């Protein structure tokens, strides 16, 4: 398994550039020059790079400095061929965002945060990005009385609709994607899961260009099924981007390499991305982006090893998932379990409610105890899946 640009593997600058600072200790690695991240990622088979405005351009950069940096960064892109499919804003690091950007209690701070976002949209637009991601990191609270919850959602809506409205106004070919996270750094973050993100989108004036950016580990932080979460996003056609990584339980956001967390779950995510739905339906065609952090214990050879580990894991899973669905044995198991029967409408063509209620075969004389006898054989289907995954079939 050798990744090629065709594979569409994208990495964030903050991923491989992650310094090692955690809540209990300082950085273990020296800062990484962005030019060098580009060159290194290009040599590994990456297709593109993504960043946060402050990952590239310092908060206090002068204009001459801003120009220099972009010149260097575009030079690296031009020399290597890397694309920049997504750009994002840092609304969490500076002490000004301690209560949030868009949902800060302070109105002057909310204004500043939306201005930071609008300028960042211009940047994204000039970099040629297709997606613009919003992670509301500091949006939430530690205490239930800190906020007016209907007012926090109005202020969130205001911000996203101003940003969406501006995109349309300028005619940029950009979509907004929201990234849910249940907690950390706040005790409770607003729009904590894929479901809440989807629900909020439907209340927006400019919801047509607003979608989701689910992250593996974040749904697993609420103990949810990541594959089910992204299936719901797909089904609603709001899967605009994805962040792949690993999480080993309900605890702090680990951001491990993709497949280094829940393996079986990783396996079914890849099947969903590659094979789509058994009965057909929408398919995700965007970048396969890794939002992970090289463990702080590892030094620079470890940083490039971990980058590579993401792409290897994905390709190894993909091979197995393709083999899995191609197996005649598996296709037979699927049939028996009623995976294909779930695809059939419950009602007959032009059958009404009333028609079903008096159909005696369906209710009045339906043999409930004979129907309960079906052996779904879901265990055998799971065993087959795991045998493909272990490459023993």
């Amino acid at each position: 398994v050798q990744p090629t640009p065709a594979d569409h593997f994208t990495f964030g600058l903050w991923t491989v550039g992650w310094t090692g600072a955690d809540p209990f200790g300082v950085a273990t690695r020296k800062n990484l020059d962005p030019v060098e991240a580009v060159h290194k990622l290009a040599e590994l088979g990456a297709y593109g790079i993504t960043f946060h405005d402050n990952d590239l351009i310092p908060f206090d950069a002068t204009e001459a400095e801003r120009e220099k940096i972009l010149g260097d960064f575009n030079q690296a892109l031009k020399d290597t061929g890397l694309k920049v499919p997504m750009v994002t804003t840092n609304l969490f690091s500076h002490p000004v965002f301690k209560d949030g950007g868009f949902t800060s209690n302070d109105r002057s701070i909310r204004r500043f945060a939306l201005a930071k976002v609008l300028h960042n949209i211009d940047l994204a637009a000039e970099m040629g990005a297709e997606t613009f991601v919003m992670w509301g990191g500091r949006e939430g609270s530690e205490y239930d009385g800190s906020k007016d919850l209907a007012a926090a959602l109005d202020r969130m809506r205001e911000g996203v609709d101003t940003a969406a409205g501006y995109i349309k106004d300028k005619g940029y070919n950009l979509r907004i994607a929201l990234e849910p996270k249940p907690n950390e750094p706040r005790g409770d973050i607003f729009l904590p899961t894929v479901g809440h993100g989807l629900a909020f989108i439907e209340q927006l004036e400019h919801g047509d260009i607003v979608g989701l950016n689910p992250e593996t580990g974040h749904e697993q932080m609420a103990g949810l099924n990541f594959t089910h979460g992204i299936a719901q996003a797909l089904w609603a056609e709001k899967l605009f981007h994805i962040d792949l990584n690993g999480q080993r339980g309900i605890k702090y956001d680990q951001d491990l390499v993709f497949g280094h967390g829940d393996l079986t779950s990783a396996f079914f995510t890849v099947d969903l991305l590659e094979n789509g739905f058994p009965n057909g339906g929408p398919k995700y065609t965007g970048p396969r982006h890794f939002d992970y952090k090289p463990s702080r214990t590892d030094g620079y050879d470890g940083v490039w090893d971990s980058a590579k580990a993401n792409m290897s894991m994905y390709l190894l899973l993909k091979e197995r998932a393709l083999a899995f669905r191609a197996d005649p044995e598996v296709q037979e198991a699927m049939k028996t379990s009623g995976v294909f029967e779930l695809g059939e409408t419950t009602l007959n063509a032009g059958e009404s409610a009333a028609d079903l209620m008096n159909d005696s075969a369906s209710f009045a004389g339906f043999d409930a105890e004979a129907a309960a006898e079906r052996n779904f054989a879901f265990i055998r289907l799971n065993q087959l899946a795991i045998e493909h995954l272990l490459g023993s079939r």
Copy 2:
């Protein structure tokens, strides 16, 4: 604290009628006659009763028997004055529903399940219920390959839209409410949280009459903030009913008496229900329904004690929450923390995106480091809330 019908305390028949059978042991209490539950609940101050079709009418009841039972149950209602505000269907107990009702893999079972629901709507309509609740208990899976996830959501939609369509067709003054649960009895249940329920509703043809029925313990089972979840439902105006209980962590569905789980959270739920949003907004005006189970260790005096404990806890919380918001000290704390400033729109009247981006006060010359100096004083606000709760103020 003495509950009166005015309070709108509703109880399910299965709550006080819960027998004590769990996964590791048999029933510890004898079955409770429904007539006796009515009479007992009436004497305690209940406003009404709710039930599942099979809580009242056995699965295999003959027509003569069905008639008898309803006659007895309506007699009890007439004698005591209890209303029946909500009715629900059991799509989980019989062995036929082992893979679900609406999303079973077997099409004949899906047909039977929707027929069971349609007949149950007629029943609800003749009982004078305002709400009809759907809990998809067996809808989900243990294994990721068991289902076609886009097909499971199409089949879920079919069912709910047929039911919604039928309501409109018959002209019943009934609303449908979905109840989310993350897991148990399935490893993963579809529409696992308030957020996912809300998101699914927006894909329905008849979504105008479909809302939510969040249960305290169920959101706490994913480690979410129940108050935030219901605030999102309110804000979207989809809070059609609620099930109040307690949960002491991420573990099996406990269904403890309301306030016997997370107390501080219970306190802020009650404030939200009673006081509404600090800056104004929608208010929940339906029944305050308890979906709990008297612990299996307790015998019949314990059953009526626990019923009473629900209503006492609610009234005690309500007193404290009303006192809390009325306190001048608390109103001052709120002001300082910017609870009222969150209510102000971020943008000025007729201010555009572009207007904000060039306003130099808001970005270019905004003093980020002086703005970061604000002391939100959220700890002091929480301390005041807890002092009201402990009745020390």
Copy 3:
């Protein structure tokens, strides 16, 4: 793969005999005869069968029925050659155990539970069991004021020490193993994890013959690392028996097939059980017991598929764990990461605390900045395990 008796694969009667009654519904399968059970497991490659007293002998059974049942059961053992390596007592099913066996608040129930255990030691001894397991499923509470916590542990000690003294007094060749569980069916169960069980054993009079019986799923319900927990039990030489199964997350006890939960973790559990420690040390030599439940959606063909599935999963993982450790690249990766260096004592032979302190090379003139540069290469070592597990190397 194909299992044989030399593999030491043991199953409980209650596993394959699990009929499907959960808290939300009735049984989906017919009762399994115990003689059928024995013949079927023996045909599958099993080495032994385990049981709870009431799995074989009904609570009500007269002395005549006891003897009839045992005689048929012993014949089947005889005909097949299956051993009975472990025996256990049901102290959780019957309503009398609603507040516990050994720690019930009621003194007369405590005496009855102890008598029940004493009788069961005699049947255990008589069957040839080497281990007697005690799972305190009803020992605990829902509310914190329910028990005197010091008195609960004294009563727990008293039961265990009487059971252990009785073995010693009779000279039975039996050991007691305690099975930890954090919750379910109690809100909080006493001795909730491997650590707490281990700690308790040290306060016993007859501690020398009391060890543990860890269960995969149970430590995973507190979000703990199962391999770390069994490592500590081994290390302390207290790993007397084991229950292997799967669990996906912190939720209700699932008891899935071993390998159908956390796959990566299952792999490293197999590596510690089969292979032991990289620097050498203790080894677990007992039965590989499976405590699982065949999913209720499946029929009897699924029950027998699932028993096979436990054994295949373990053998597949065993193969992979062997290949992984045998790999020269892995051994070299292990060396780089300091795996073997951890095995060297910190102090030199004869060195004292005072010698280490004043050694200027270990403290005063130690270059902490230089030592921090070490690449431990833990991501790379984890990637090599995963590739071995995917059968990619």
Copy 4:
């Protein structure tokens, strides 16, 4: 309320000195001078102050700086009268501890970490501390193949036993206390719960002077009951010190003010610390230490508000716990539930296992169906605690 030194309220320098740098952003407050800290806590009613070696003495400090810093610090102690009851070592901040102190894979780091601890015992002894706390924050791993689990525990034992032998050898009047944590910053930390710490202590050569230092929040991160866990440490006579704080759920370590997490649990923790056991037994007599962090959204007025808040919360709950137990209705409710009956031994004075077995009244002729009817009235007893806690009785 108002706290006084007789209350034994102790705070760590790192608590009020916590500047706000989290994993997603920089400090929001200015550094706190340690002399300012002492004066301010002494003005608040505190009895003592605790610290980590690097909280006072920088890692880099020369011998001259060490002495200057200590002299100013000792003066402040002198001027205020605050004691220094506990001292601890930072083995987690500096990059050299990226794989642990005592269990680092690197032998030279292990020696450096032990020397660092030995030097710190000398400063502890010299300050008048009675307790020396050890929190192994970097001891553990992200991946299961990273460590030899038996070698990790031997190295952990070796460090602790050298530290304990050195105290004994010098005749310092000091005890070692281990602080358990399940994860963060490591994916899995060794000795993750109270049980595991307790179990480990029993494998030590110098176990007699080694106990535990439970922290509220940490046991709650594994979803465990904190009162049950401290009860077992007490019971074993290993509760040497304690850290009190708040945590809302299984997520990142929050370290909220004590009482701002799980309120009901906080109440029952206060009842065990102040009041002890209902049937009598052990009592914890040490300092009531608060290990928390003032929320980063608040300024210095919030820091001092939060220190006050810890002390008020504890005193408010203490009042309520006293009134609760003193209440004659509660005492009578306790009696009904068997709280005092649990305190009676199961066996009669002189009775043997063989006597209990053959007593026909305890087994053979016991009416299990009659005994099962007992109403334990645990819901009613929990309701009485809650009403006392709400200051309603």
